[PDB]
Amino acid sequence: AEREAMLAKTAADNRKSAEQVAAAQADYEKEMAEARAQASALRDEARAAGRSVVDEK
Amino acid sequence: IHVGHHTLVFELFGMTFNGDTILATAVTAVIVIALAFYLRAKVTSTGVPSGVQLFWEALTIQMRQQIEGSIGMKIAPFVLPLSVTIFVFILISNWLAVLPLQYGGGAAAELYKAPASDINFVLALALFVFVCYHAAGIWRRGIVGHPIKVVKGHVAFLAPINIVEELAKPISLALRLFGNIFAGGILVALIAMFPWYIQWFPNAVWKTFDLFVGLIQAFIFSLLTILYFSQSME
């Protein structure tokens, strides 16, 4: 049973380590791009507010 | 060649016992027990297995594979210990005869004669296996159902043949082991009639090949035990 579980762990770790490195890279990229998207939306909201204030004034 | 004449013979409980055969069986049992205990002390799931661990693992894996390929391990969990103990017992009994435990009287005497060379040892093993797998068949089929299947076998109109083959299962399984080792006990005795300067050659070759012969006999006895179990359980 010990040999069996050892095989099982060798299998999972390799897999889970690979998948978790991939997931860490993907999640860092996703969070960074979400931050960029929020920044772009904020800048566009500022542009819209500026256009609105110039038009109203 | 003076066949027979078991030494250390005694009498107890109103029946005779061959002392030498009992001593050889006890020696084999203590060797097997020492191997088992040394495994138990040094059995490692995570560490690197020892020599005895590798031996036991290989034997257990072989017998478990046989059971899987003949009758599911779920149905026959109790037959793996039987096969392993049978294999080790017979193997050690046969291989302990390779040691130079023989001398000259002026007939040749042998301190350790392989217990299988005695009819009692092989008959006891064969009858124990016989009772064991017949009880297994009774358990898996029923007290009345199992004999009916045993007599019928795979072909009903061959009912007597089955009834012979069944009785042939223990007998052969005993005598096949008997004659193979018994015969050896004679050859070593016969080769003892040679003078020392030419005795070593036939003795050397015979016992070198008897190592393999005893290994094969232990393997065959265990394999046929497993096969008979698979037959009698379903």
TrEMBL record, chain B:
One of its GO terms (biological process) is proton motive force-driven plasma membrane ATP synthesis. Keywords: ATP synthesis, Cell membrane, CF(0), Hydrogen ion transport, Hydrolase, Ion transport, Membrane, Transmembrane, Transmembrane helix, Transport. SUPFAM superfamilies: F1F0 ATP synthase subunit A. GO terms for molecular function: hydrolase activity; proton-transporting ATP synthase activity, rotational mechanism. The chain crosses the membrane at residues 21-39, 78-101, 119-139, 177-199, 211-230. F-type ATPases have 2 components, CF(1) - the catalytic core - and CF(0) - the membrane proton channel. CF(1) has five subunits: alpha(3), beta(3), gamma(1), delta(1), epsilon(1). CF(0) has three main subunits: a(1), b(2) and c(9-12). The alpha and beta chains form an alternating ring which encloses part of the gamma chain. CF(1) is attached to CF(0) by a central stalk formed by the gamma and epsilon chains, while a peripheral stalk is formed by the delta and b chains. Belongs to the ATPase A chain family. This is ATP synthase subunit a. It comes from Mycolicibacterium smegmatis (strain ATCC 700084 / mc(2)155) (Mycobacterium smegmatis).
